[model samples]
Each structure stands twice: as structure tokens, then as C-alpha cells.
Target: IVMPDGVTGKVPSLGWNSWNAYHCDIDESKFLSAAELIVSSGLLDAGYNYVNIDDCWSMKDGRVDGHIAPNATRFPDGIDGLAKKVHALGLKLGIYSTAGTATCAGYPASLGYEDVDAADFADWGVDYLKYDNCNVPSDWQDEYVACNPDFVKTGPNGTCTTALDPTLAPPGYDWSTSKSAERFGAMRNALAKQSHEIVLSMCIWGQADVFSWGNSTGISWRMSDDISPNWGSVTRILNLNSFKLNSVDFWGHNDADMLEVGNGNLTAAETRTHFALWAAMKSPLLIGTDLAQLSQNNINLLKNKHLLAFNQDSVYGQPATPYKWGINPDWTFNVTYPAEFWAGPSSKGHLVLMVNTLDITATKEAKWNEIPGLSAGHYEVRDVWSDKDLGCLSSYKAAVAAHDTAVILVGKKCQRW
Candidate 1:
């Protein structure tokens, strides 16, 4: 399988990106200040890294030449210098681009210049690379069916891939197809061929199935669209928990984008639920709010130690399988497993169990049976966020706040299971 090095060390990446806030207007000072706050606010210490600068960060001349130049208007210091600032803070910096001549937002791309661009990122102290396949091939479908097999290869984790062929055309596939795994994989191959250990994060927004294949192609990919700053967006994220969490545990992992809790759309409770579900599902914890002036409550939400541990656990990467449903009797269902758990041996016998809320409402009042995989046991559930012992629950009844998160650590004294 094609998993990243952190698989045995941590639970993928957890950090922030500029795309969510600054969007195409990402500035240098704003970028640094955000990183500065992440460091000062103890988010870095809280297990968050990967402070990324998304699209349009390099648009001084409107040319998409695969150059990762910092937008002079927005990022006056250029990319390399900004990277140095982030590196000095002990955080990994990720830059975004596309495989075409332009980015998803029509900014410059790194296509046909993978080596130069990849080298540029390495030189800039860029630790991660989020390469998109959008706006590249209006004729990708014909090419894919003709040349997929030659380009595709197995990834480090348990994912499958079919390469992109320039002359190929599957019955219903093409470059114009927005969700072609082959097209994304082609870019993955390009990055993989790079000299630097550039983490390839494919960005084909909201293509869960193809991303299952993308795990076989890169480190991570988005499971949904660029997260919107609204409760509706949060709800969509929560509803995706069952689907995405399973993918993270089984296929690879699911990503919905950076955290939106502190963006001022949902209440703290709703935000909490959002965090809890992501942690449970073990999705990458990327902050999407304005880091420069985050409220104390928002800070606490990101600084939850116990919950962070579960999301960062190196063992038990295995995902949850379904069990039951009843919220709408028409659209609601519960994950069969009582504890959506991922195990690892990093902290010795500690296993992280994320209690997720799959309910559509803001508050889900569920009984033990609502959670499918739980059996009778005196599991010691330690609240990962609060660092307080949640005591033991022999029974299996728990409430999951709407779009909120709750992670706990379950451990024993044994080194071997």
C-alpha cells in the first residue's frame, strides 16, 4: 500500500491553510501572522502543523509557469522567504499549484515543469505539495483510456491506481471529467518522481471514490468541496463522517478541508462537534480560520490535547464499518462500531477512540445500540481534548453534539496486543 511515513508515527497532517480565509487574496504579512499566531497560541505544540498557502499565492504577472512565487501584492516576501519563516517556527509549509498551466482558480501551474517547481518548493523550505489536476486537460478522457496503465503505480499505502494515457479513451472517461483518478494519478506520479520527499495532496474537490484511489496515488486528497463557512457546510461535513471516517481507516483517509470552527459561522458547540467527528474519523486537522486573532474558545477547540492524540495516533489506522441507522428512518444510520477507534503503539498501550456524531440534527440523542460496534466492556475513556478522565462507561449510551467532536484515549499496560 502507499501510505506516508507518518502512518506509523502520527495520524496524517493537522494544521491550517490560507485558501480558506484569504482565498485568492493571501498576503505575506497575513500568512506570517497566521503562522506566528499558530506558534504563539500553542497550536503547533498542540500537534498542528502543515501551515499551507493555497492557490494564487504566486501571481505577480498572471503567468502560470509552475513558479511558486509569492504574490507580491499579497505576499511581498516571495515564497522562499515565507517558507523560511514557517520552517524556523518548526512547522511544515505546504504550497499549492496545478499540473496544468493554471491552478484551480486559474493561477499559474507547475505542469511540464515538475522538476523545476518541485525543486523550487524544496528550496523554499516547502515541506508539502498540494497539486491539483483541474483546468489541465479538457481532453483528458481520451488520453486516460489510452495511457492510464503505463503511468499508474502502487502507492505506499493500500490504494490502487490506473495511469493516464495521452491516446486512451475509456467508454465514459476523459480529461474534461472533473473526477478522473487517472488524471490526478498522473500528477501524483510526477511528484513521486521528484527528488524531494514532497507530500503529494491531490485536490479534486469532493470526489470520495476517486480519492480512495488517490490514497494509492498521494498522501491525502479532499473528500468534499472547499469547506464553506456555514452550518450547512458543517452539516455536510458531519454527514460525511460515516463515509469518510471509514475511508481514513480502511482505504486511506478522508479530507474535507481545513477546520472552520472559529470562522464565526457555527456556535462553539457546533464547532466542537465538527472537531470531534474529524478527530474520530482521524481526518487531517487543518485550521481554516483567521489564526492571527482567534478567540480563546476557538483556541481551546484547536488545543484539545486528548482529542488531538486520537487524531494523531499512529496505530489502528483501520476505519470503521457500518452497523445501523434511524435518525430520519429514511436517511439516518449509525456506524455499527461503538467506538470509532484507530490504534497505534506510539504511546505504548494507548489506543485512540473517536466518538462521532452521525446525526443530522445539532444534537443526537442516541442509545448504546445506536453505535454498532460496541460490546459490553469497561472501557476507560479518557477525554482527549480535556485531558481529564471521562471515567468508564460499562454501558454504551452517549450523545454526540451536532457537527462537534469528542476524542478519547483507551490504553492498557501491554506493549504487544
Candidate 2:
């Protein structure tokens, strides 16, 4: 995972995406409205600065003059025009494409057209590029390792396979040498030649050994499949990312997809847990909901300074690890209940998170000694979620609601409260 030149990956890109919120319903007005709300609603001040157009924003008919063309109906002013407006508001604009010939929505993509697309994106002043994995020609597809979802051999409730088979990449398998890497790296190389420092977001959906070679090209890579607006989708992603946190750091992150904080079917507790874990995991925090109708509570949850501080911690690129498995013993691969306790070190000290992944509310504990650090003395504990000063404690415990999380900042000095 080499951190390339021109890319400033001090922290994972913090932003909002258009996919989960509107999908193909995207328009210039929606982006401008969301961008306006991002600033007016204080999310911009809190550090979410990118406003991205996900899929279907381009013309499906064909490219113009052998270059990706913005849909005239959807984006009347053109992507370059939208980019100017977004930039005027002090935010970067991100556009999307796939590694193949067509996007997930079947629009023209950037496979063999890397140079033209890269130059065009830079010319349009695109600050971030979300390159997805879809519709690849069979000649460009990787060899079948049987590591795909259908080939998984184990899971709870006979729930098919989420685990990458060990044989997915055999001995001395150079991921950088793989066909998938070639496809993604082609764009990265093209983007590098451009003068603009556009951040490439590898939306590979955890396939083609992304973890091993992603940072070699882009700042972040999707660690799993697309996330949906439900508890099940959120839990599945958390379970997949629990043990995979080790691969994330300063220049690269394991993206947990866009946020579902204000989306469908999620309860208040579930929404809070989703944001907390995504933030704790240090995934690129892209809000995936309509900004206009988002509830005040959900907006405030997104503005939780304490939790956000952990993710953007300048001194700590590493994310909070599951200190102890909540339901089962440590290292057990249980999707229903992933390791529930998380602790990551920041310049401000360790911000610990305790989750209740169970069906019902449960008490989750964070024993100071049990965590990887701070074993010597009683720590000052402050409930970050409630903004309360707990003074000091040897160990802290809370009865977290079902599908919810309890976040606290633990320091040796109580004055931080």
C-alpha cells in the first residue's frame, strides 16, 4: 500500500454521496441544495466537504467526442458548471465512473478510456473520482478463485459465505500484478499525469484482492459489498470489517460504503450504531441520504464531535479495534454479533465504543486493562454521546440499547471533560 505523490491522504476523505439518497434521481439542483445544506447545517464546519454525484449522472447514449459526457437533462449546466458552483461554496465535487465499459446503472464507464476520462475530469475541476467495479469485459475479469459470495463454505444459520476463502490468492500472488489492479491502476496512472490532485475512490466492493493492492493506487477502497438502509446490511458490513481494520491507515482506508443514517427502516439506535462504527472504523464518512429531509437528531448525530475526532485524528491513522468480542470469544466470525467493543488511540486519548449487536438491549463493558492500551491506572471517563463528565473510573460499563453503541473518551486526566 504505497502512498503515491500528489495525493494528500492525511485523513480519509470526508464527504456525502448521491447514490443511497437519490440514485438515478440525481440533478444539479439536488447537489447544490445538499451542498448549501452541508454548509448551512454546520456539516461543512464539522469537516464534511465533498458533494458527490454517484451513478447515472453521465449520458448513457454514448460519450461525446470520445469523452465521458454529462447528461444534459440531469445536469443541464454540465458537470464542469456544477463543479464551479460547488467550488465557489468551498467544497470539492466528486464524480463517478466504473473500471469497466459500463457502470452499475449501465452508463458508459472508464475502462480503455482512462487517459481521456482523467484529463476530462481534471479539466472539469473534479476534485474526487469514485471509480467503481462493474460490467467488466470477461477478458478483463480475474480468474475464478471461488472466493466470491456464492463460493463461501461457512456461516451462521447456513447464511452463505462472507469470508474470503484462503485460497482466493495463492502463495506469492501479487495483487498489484492482477488484472483488477491493472484496470484500476490504469485510471490512477492517468489521473497522476493530470495537474489536478483528484482523489481516486476505489469502489471495488472488496473484490480482486483490493485490500492488498488498493492503497497502492487510491486513498480508499470498499471493504465489502454496497451498504443498504437496514440493520441487516449495516451488521453484515460491520462483521466483514471487524477483523479487517488492520489494513487501514493514514493514506488508505477500508471504505464501509456511504452512510445510511437518515435512510430507510433503521431505528434511532440502529442509525447511531451505524454512524459510530463507520466513524470508529475510520471509513471515509460519506453521508448517503437526502439532506433536505434529514431529521435534526440525525444531523446532530452526524455532527458528534467526539466520534468524528477519532476518525480524523491527525496523530492516529489507525482505527479503534474490537478490544473484546461482545457475544463470543475474540476472533470468532459471527455476523449476527461482531466484536462489540472498539477502542482507538487519538491525540486526545482513546475513544472507546461499546456496541450491543444483540436483538435486545444489553450491557456492554470496556475494561481499561483489557483494552490494548492504558493498563496502568484509573482513567478519566467522559460519556461523549451524552456529553457528561464521569470524572474517573477503573472500568466503565453501560447498558447500550439494541443495535446501538456507547462512545466515551478515556484519558488519564479528568480535566478533558
All candidates' TM-scores? 0.75, 0.94
The lDDT for every candidate, in the order shown, is: 0.59, 0.85
lDDT string for model 1 (210-248, tens) is 534655666666665667776666655555455445446
The lDDT of model 1 is 0.59
Q: Which residues of candidate 2, in runs, are more than 4 Å off? A: 1-7, 146-172, 413-417
Candidate 2: tens digits of C-alpha lDDT, residues 181-290: 89999998999899887888999888776887887888899978888899988888888888678789988999999999889999999998999999999999999898
